[PDB]
Structure 1
Amino acid sequence: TTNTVAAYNLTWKSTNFKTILEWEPKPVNQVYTVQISTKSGDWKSKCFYTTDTECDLTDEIVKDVKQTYLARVFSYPAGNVESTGSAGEPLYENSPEFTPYLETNLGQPTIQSFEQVGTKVNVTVEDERTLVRRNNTFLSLRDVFGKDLIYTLYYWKSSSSGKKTAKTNTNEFLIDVDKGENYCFSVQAVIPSRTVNRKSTDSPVECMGQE
């Protein structure tokens, strides 16, 4: 219209289900209103008449991480408008589709602790808490993906050659080490069943004699 431009570059920013919709451009005499819906669903307004160029949609997508979502950003004129005729009203742009389950990014994992139990070392990776709520509790990464989530351990002797690997479908690894040694490990989460965004980044590395 004569006082409004449609938003563009509607991109979804989601890591561990924390979901923000980002768009352009920084407004001038214009405010936005962001709406969300499951594909083919009712539309619901979340961020109202704001000058912000992003909207946190976590509270809604978390209602059912399996649903496919669609967002709509409206452009509204702001301030003392020309009057004369009448401000045209409601230009909006639809976001790309978002299936949180299949698309949220797996954040970088953290090794919680390792301990030597004989010739065996037990590596526990931290269970990350999410905002997915069920009953009166927040689900963890593991609680949400269940058997779909897998961890990979990379460990190598502080000295050399290659890194050996191990995988687990729980939050812990139990491995055989060359006794009385210094080993370093790092872990990476993976969702094998995904065609895209399958892996996370490696956790920082931890070593045996951390002193």
Structure 2
Amino acid sequence: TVAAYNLTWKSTNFKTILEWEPKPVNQVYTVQISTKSGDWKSKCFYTTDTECDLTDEIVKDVKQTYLARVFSYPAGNVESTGSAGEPLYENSPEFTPYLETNLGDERTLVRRNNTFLSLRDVFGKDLIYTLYYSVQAVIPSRTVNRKSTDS
């Protein structure tokens, strides 16, 4: 079994998909996601994909910091374990949706009561848009990402 590597969060408007490598040769993967104090939840069970949508989990609380890990199993032997009697895995980067998700009123993927909440509902009377003085959304308190693409 080879461990996954290059675990990466691709996220735009809270639609969050973890991606990783390699393309599996006779191997399958499962992902677990948690917040730092929460329990691990499994997703994309025994997939041959190298991506896993995690939107559903991260929009529950977009202000948490999630960590994800990817397990590698022999396809067929989904009960594989290394010397520690545990399946091989690799961790992702930490991801705090609210501070790292790329920006694209516009509904985001964050749902409240199944309806989607829009950008302004998630960022409050605290989100601002550049005109020149072409619009660009900016979240000026961000360390990363901060400005959207232009319109």
Same fold (TM over 0.5): yes
What CA deviation, in whole Å up to 9, does each residue of 1:70-126 have, x standing for no partner? Answer: 1010000014899999997610011110000000001xxxxxxxxxxxxxxxxxxxx
8 Å CA contact 1:148, 1:192 repeated in 2: no
**Contact map agreement 1:76 1:89 (CA 8 A) in 2:** no
Tell me how many residue pairs correspond in the alignment.
150
- TM superposition shift of 1:135: 2.3
**Contact 2:73-2:79 at 8 Å conserved across structures:** no
Larger Rg: 1
When residues 82 and 50 of structure 1 are mapped into structure 2, their CA distance, relative to the original with a 3 A threshold, is closer
Kindly, what percent of the aligned residue pairs are identical?
Answer: 100
* TM-score (normalizing by structure 2): 0.90
Equivalent in the alignment of 2:5: 8
The answer on whether the counterparts of 2:135 and 2:150 sit within 8 Å (CA) in structure 1 is yes
Check whether the contact 1:77–1:89 (CA below 8 A) recurs between aligned residues: no
Q: Distance in 1 between matches of 2:79 and 2:123?
A: 53
Q: Deviations over 1:138-196 (max 9, x none)?
A: 100111001231011138xxxxxxxxxxxxxxxxxxxxxxxxxxxxxx11100011121
**Inter-CA distance 80–36: structure 2 relative to 1 (3 Å threshold):** closer
Secondary structure, counterpart of 2:131 in structure 1: strand
Which is worse superposed, 139-148 or 68-77?
Answer: 139-148
> What are the ranges of 5 or more consecutive residues in structure 1 without an aligned counterpart?
107-126, 156-185, 204-211
Structure 1's 152 and 51: CA in aligned 2 closer, same or farther, altered over 3 A?
same
Q: Retained in 1: the 8 A contact 2:66–2:95?
A: yes
Q: TM-score if structure 1 supplies the norm length?
A: 0.65
Q: CA deviation at 1:40?
A: 3.1
1:50-65 alignment, distance < 5 Å: 50-65=47-62
SS of 2:85's partner is: coil
After superposition, the Cα gap between the structure-2 partners of 1:190 and 1:50, relative to the gap in structure 1 and judged at 3 Å, is same
Greater RCO between the two (CA within 8 Å, min separation 6)? 2
CA RMSD of aligned residues (A): 3.0
Cα distance in 1, alignment partners of residues 113 and 43 from structure 2: 23
Which ranges in structure 2 are unaligned for 5 or more consecutive residues?
Answer: none
Change beyond 3 A, Cα 1:86–1:190: closer
Dislocated runs of 4+, deviation >2 Å: 79-89
8 Å CA contact 1:37, 1:69 repeated in 2:
yes
What SS does the corresponding residue of 1:102 show, helix, strand or coil?
Answer: helix
